[PDB]
Amino acid sequence: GGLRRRDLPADPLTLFERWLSQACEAKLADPTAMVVATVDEHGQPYQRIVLLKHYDEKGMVFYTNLGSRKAHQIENNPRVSLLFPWHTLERQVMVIGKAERLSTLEVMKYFHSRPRDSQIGAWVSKQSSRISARGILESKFLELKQKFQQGEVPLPSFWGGFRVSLEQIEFWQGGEHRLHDRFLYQRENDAWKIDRLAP
Amino acid sequence: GGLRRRDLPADPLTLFERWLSQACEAKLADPTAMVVATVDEHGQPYQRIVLLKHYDEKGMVFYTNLGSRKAHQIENNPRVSLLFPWHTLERQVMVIGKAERLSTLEVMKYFHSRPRDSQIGAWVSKQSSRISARGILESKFLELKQKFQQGEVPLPSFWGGFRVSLEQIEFWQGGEHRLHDRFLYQRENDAWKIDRLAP
């Protein structure tokens, strides 16, 4: 039935929650997978996929290695863009905001709530650095996989997370006659301003 | 069998061609769909999906409306990133380069080789501008769909294309034990330098 303004919820997260729910129901691979774009010191954008782990009015959260390229880029420029590649369902959601670091209390909590093999793998790689061979990863994994025995596997000091604020949330949905529906929610004065955008 | 350096082709496009071919064979929705990231005058990155239409050593090509936000952003900062969200196949390909405008000869050629209903739709929308109602699109479409009769449908002066140069091409492929394989090809002195990156 297309996407009409009169049917839009006041809070964009209500629409996002609905769409995310429908993506899970349609069994898309990694429905929480989103492409995060950051920008380096030279004005060059970079992209990579990460998984959305939690979200609310304060923003969308993902975890990563603090020595990674995306982390170094965010430290120099906190402005990021997030895009949910849901084109298989003829949809896209894009979020614009600032990335802020999570506290260790938050990171520890989430970290110890995930499968133990994932807790162990977080220790393995010096994410994004050049390495001379795959073997380096394999050896370290074997070492950690035994040195820990997985007693409770501690939080690496280089593991962290970012919360991206919700400054703008844009929805795209395939439309009849290829006349696609686009709505931009823009945070303005403690409220959301909504505008339809030409496709 | 994982991705080992000894098996990598000298030209990254050889690997890309192979992966793209396998994505089509696996019937992924829009295998040519890629997320293009651009940056505005304030250092804010923006993203949206577009379709890869052609590619060779000079770069990857997509078409769009010249009055769109991505076009305005490229005019101020030609640095872009392209990402193929092929995670359903446990893969990602990211391309870093500069976007350059295509000539009208090239644009006309491609434009007149695509279905006539798509040629007509290109005229409809003032892409990315705020519009007060969906009806604006519908009325214009009806008008154009009859004013043209589709005789041969002319090229809109505001329709164009960009070719993104190949400065860096990065491949990501899911690995055993979640130890993913990443290879970065970087254009250096008329050649490609290849490095494995930690996951």
Ligand SMILES: Cc1cc2nc3c(=O)[nH]c(=O)nc-3n(C[C@H](O)[C@H](O)[C@H](O)COP(=O)(O)O)c2cc1C
């Ligand atoms: C489906 C999927 C989910 C991923 N999730 C994460 C994640 O949540 N955090 C992370 O650090 N990397 C994740 N990655 C790997 C990133 O895409 C990227 O390879 C890595 O974070 C290093 O990026 P960087 O070098 O730009 O910093 C994921 C990859 C795929 C394909």
Ligand SMILES: Cc1cc2nc3c(=O)[nH]c(=O)nc-3n(C[C@H](O)[C@H](O)[C@H](O)COP(=O)(O)O)c2cc1C
């Ligand atoms: C699968 C898919 C393919 C698309 N292909 C194109 C394209 O090739 N060119 C284009 O201008 N927009 C395309 N779009 C629409 C863009 O994502 C975006 O809505 C539009 O270009 C305006 O972006 P901008 O406002 O950032 O400039 C596509 C959307 C989807 C979901």
